[PDB]
Amino acid sequence: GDRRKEMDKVYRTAFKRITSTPDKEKRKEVVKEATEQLRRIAKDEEEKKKAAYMILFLKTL
């Protein structure tokens, strides 16, 4: 519930930061920072499946 909202908040905050960084190496550092936080929030099967699904999509950026 409320944890699912913080996930989308981290994703959108990470999406904006990733796609405004010209340094391709610094973009991977932003993913890794969002990776650790996202894994630190989710607790259910669907929420963990969501936090994973996000992580792979920021890599598509």
Binding site: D8, Y11, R12, F15, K16, R39, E45, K48, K49, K50, A51, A52, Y53, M54, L56, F57, K59, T60
Partner: protein
């Protein structure tokens, strides 16, 4: 200002025989696309902490699968996402020997 909207029906659960070819469909109404497979490691698709083994396969959106094997079956997912969020619909593939 929304997550991407996908055609509700697809992908559809498909059954195929080994050695045959397979095509999985996705339809986006709008936004990048990447397909995924759910990897089963020792009879469990989930890892140590409870996260799923999921692998990106590629990036109407069709995915060609030629000469499917036993390891090719499982759960496939279509990830669409934008600035706001993501949307995903999953289907399961079935492989049959002769």
């Amino acid at each position: 200002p929304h997550r991407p909207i996908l055609q509700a029906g697809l992908p559809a659960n498909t059954t195929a025989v080994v050695g045959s070819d397979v095509e999985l469909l996705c339809k986006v109404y709008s936004p990048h696309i990447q397909w995924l497979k759910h990897i089963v490691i020792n009879g469990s698709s989930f890892g140590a902490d409870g996260f799923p083994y999921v692998q990106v396969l590629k990036t109407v959106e069709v995915l060609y699968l030629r000469n499917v094997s036993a390891e090719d079956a499982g759960e496939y997912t279509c990830l669409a996402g934008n600035s706001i969020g993501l949307s995903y619909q999953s289907a399961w593939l079935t492989v049959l020997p002769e």
